[PDB]
Amino acid sequence: RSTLVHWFRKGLRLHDNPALSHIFTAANAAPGRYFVRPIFILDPGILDWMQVGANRWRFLQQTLEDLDNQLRKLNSRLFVVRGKPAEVFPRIFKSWRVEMLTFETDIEPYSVTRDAAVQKLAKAEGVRVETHCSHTIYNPELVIAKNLGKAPITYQKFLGIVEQLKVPKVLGVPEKLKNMPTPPKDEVEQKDSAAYDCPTMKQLVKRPEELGPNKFPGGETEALRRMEESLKDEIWVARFEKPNTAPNSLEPSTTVLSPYLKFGCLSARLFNQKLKEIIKRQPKHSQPPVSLIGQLMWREFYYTVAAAEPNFDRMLGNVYCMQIPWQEHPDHLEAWTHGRTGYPFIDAIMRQLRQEGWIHHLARHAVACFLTRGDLWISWEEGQRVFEQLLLDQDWALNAGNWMWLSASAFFHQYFRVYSPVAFGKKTDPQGHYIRKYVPELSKYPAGCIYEPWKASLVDQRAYGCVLGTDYPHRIVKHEVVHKENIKRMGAAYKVNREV
């Protein structure tokens, strides 16, 4: 008896999962011949390549637990294998007598390298590998081909391409396993009945004092519930305009499906199909790019450009990226990282980010403009790295693409438009309720200066019980000075890159 193995990495879901579905149908169309091992590999190697913060570790823990629970309902289970894939797969290929391996493809460079090696091993041992592109709606390889070998570098051009492509068939959940025994314990399982169980919170989360509020539980079950909750107001969905949603409402102004899509707890193909059903129903609706479907297409766009460039997450060697002489300022980077800039709106966002692991799109705009071309003149690569640690939705291509946009390094070139760290949040939150919540030390400042506490006299600062320089920092830069200097720096960068 040989085993069929599905390998979860992303695609942490049962629904709309062709790679996992195929494994399950095969076992049921040939009972008695196959064992089924759906595995996730706790790969130590990823930690040398990316930073994971406490909150995102908790999201994965909750996700793996839900995926185990969901598989049990199909008379299977999740097998979480500790160790490096390069060492893990030669062993299990033999100890399990693996006939077929399936997994959802990914475009990240670490994923490509790792998968190429695993496919070289599987070819050696006579293991059949079947891979499926289901993490994105469209296959970036097919988009690039249809555009004659180059990723479209504007959104509109991208949309004109994918409109001519076939939308994939969205699958349901696999059928339960008919009369399948629990595979026999292997070398590892015999010396430890729990060697493959889902990791506890204590095993994944080493810095539990950094966990924030548990607001967005991981797992396919929660993703599907939140998706259904979001689609309940069909008018809100159909008439959604991303630029008009507030960055500083106390409750999120968008779906917060991003962590779920990032891990594949939610199929973006399923979500796209649910959105198209509502739009068909609602004749007055918004259109890309501002619509909710447009938001899914931004994800597809950044995946397509990123698939073409292995250096997508850095400035050097990145075909898309303007070469800009970013400066090193450790003390300013530290203040931004920890929300101690002295600009209450910026600091509020970075504290929401650290505590909760999600901030609104235009909140990301605000703090990203501030760190880079706006105020501090620090590389977007430094902001990407903080975002990588703290975001639940941390996504290699999306973090990089948007950081390049926000820094005027690619895709976006109107760098003379600069967000004010004082005025920007006032439009949607004139009272500063958001600031009061996430910078509570300012909670007694009135609306007239809560965005600009340095406009309060010392006497008043003492009255509000928050003296700048003691209880809340002084501004680390003066926006009105630096952003003008930085516009001139950007123009000189643009000239140098234009001449080369």
Ligand X SMILES: Cc1cc2nc3c(=O)[nH]c(=O)nc-3n(C[C@H](O)[C@H](O)[C@H](O)COP(=O)(O)OP(=O)(O)OC[C@H]3O[C@@H](n4cnc5c(N)ncnc54)[C@H](O)[C@@H]3O)c2cc1C
- Kindly list the residues in this chain that would bind ligand X in the complex (CB under 6 A): 242, 254-258, 261-262, 295-296, 298-299, 302, 360-361, 364-365, 368, 387, 391, 393-395, 398-399, 402-403, 406
| CA 121 – CA 474 distance, rounded (Å) | 58
Q: Which two tokens stand for residue 363?
A: 């909140």
Q: Tell me the helix, strand and coil percentages in the chain, rounded to 5.
A: 50, 5, 45
Is 28 annotated to bind a ligand? Reply is no
Query: Closest approach of Cβ 162 to ligand X, in Å?
Result: 14
| CA 45 – CA 110 distance, rounded (Å) | 9
Query: Closest approach of Cβ 370 to ligand X, in Å?
Result: 11
CA gyration radius, the chain: 24
Query: Closest approach of Cβ 459 to ligand X, in Å?
Result: 39
| CA 227 – CA 376 distance, rounded (Å) | 38
| CA 134 – CA 130 distance, rounded (Å) | 13
Is 255 annotated to bind a ligand? Reply is yes
Is 299 annotated to bind a ligand? Reply is yes
Query: Closest approach of Cβ 349 to ligand X, in Å?
Result: 11
The secondary element (H helix, E strand) that includes residue 244 is none
Query: Closest approach of Cβ 363 to ligand X, in Å?
Result: 8
Distance of CA 426 to the CA centre of its chain: 27
- Biggest CA-to-CA distance, the chain: 82
Query: Closest approach of Cβ 368 to ligand X, in Å?
Result: 4
Cα angle 423-361-420, degrees, rounded to a multiple of 5:
20
- Output 21 or 253, the one with its CB closest to ligand X: 253
- Output 253 or 486, the one with its CB closest to ligand X: 253
Is 297 annotated to bind a ligand? Reply is yes
Query: Closest approach of Cβ 377 to ligand X, in Å?
Result: 16
Cβ distance 275 to 109 under 8 Å? Answer: no
The secondary element (H helix, E strand) that includes residue 385 is helix 380-390
Amino acid at the residue 55: N
Query: Closest approach of Cβ 179 to ligand X, in Å?
Result: 39
| CA 73 – CA 85 distance, rounded (Å) | 27
- Output 83 or 289, the one with its CB closest to ligand X: 289
Is 393 annotated to bind a ligand? Reply is yes
- Output 26 or 170, the one with its CB closest to ligand X: 170
The secondary element (H helix, E strand) that includes residue 320 is none
- Output 56 or 436, the one with its CB closest to ligand X: 56
| CA 474 – CA 470 distance, rounded (Å) | 9
Query: Closest approach of Cβ 273 to ligand X, in Å?
Result: 14
Query: Closest approach of Cβ 254 to ligand X, in Å?
Result: 3
- Output 139 or 253, the one with its CB closest to ligand X: 253
- Output 99 or 347, the one with its CB closest to ligand X: 347
Residue nearest to ligand X (CB): 254
- Output 77 or 364, the one with its CB closest to ligand X: 364
| CA 195 – CA 212 distance, rounded (Å) | 29
What is the CB-side half-sphere exposure of residue 312 using CA atoms within 13 A? 24
Cβ distance 144 to 279 under 8 Å? Answer: no
Is 313 annotated to bind a ligand? Reply is no
Is 336 annotated to bind a ligand? Reply is no
Residue 218 three-state SS: coil
Is 256 annotated to bind a ligand? Reply is yes
- Output 99 or 382, the one with its CB closest to ligand X: 382
Is 355 annotated to bind a ligand? Reply is no
Cβ distance 368 to 424 under 8 Å? Answer: no
Residue 38 three-state SS: strand
Is 192 annotated to bind a ligand? Reply is no
| CA 326 – CA 408 distance, rounded (Å) | 12
Contacts of 46 (CB under 8 A, 6+ apart): 110
Q: Crossing angle for the helix pair 361-369 and 396-406, nearest 10 degrees?
A: 50
- Output 22 or 58, the one with its CB closest to ligand X: 58
Is 84 annotated to bind a ligand? Reply is no
| CA 119 – CA 100 distance, rounded (Å) | 12
Is 483 annotated to bind a ligand? Reply is no
- Output 3 or 255, the one with its CB closest to ligand X: 255
| CA 219 – CA 212 distance, rounded (Å) | 18
| CA 4 – CA 24 distance, rounded (Å) | 9
Is 361 annotated to bind a ligand? Reply is yes
Is 254 annotated to bind a ligand? Reply is yes
Give the position of tokens 């499926």.
132
Query: Closest approach of Cβ 127 to ligand X, in Å?
Result: 33
Q: Which residues are known binding-site members for FAD?
A: 242, 254-258, 295-302, 358, 361, 364, 393-395, 402
User: Annotated binding site, which residues?
Assistant: 242, 254-258, 295-302, 358, 361, 364, 393-395, 402
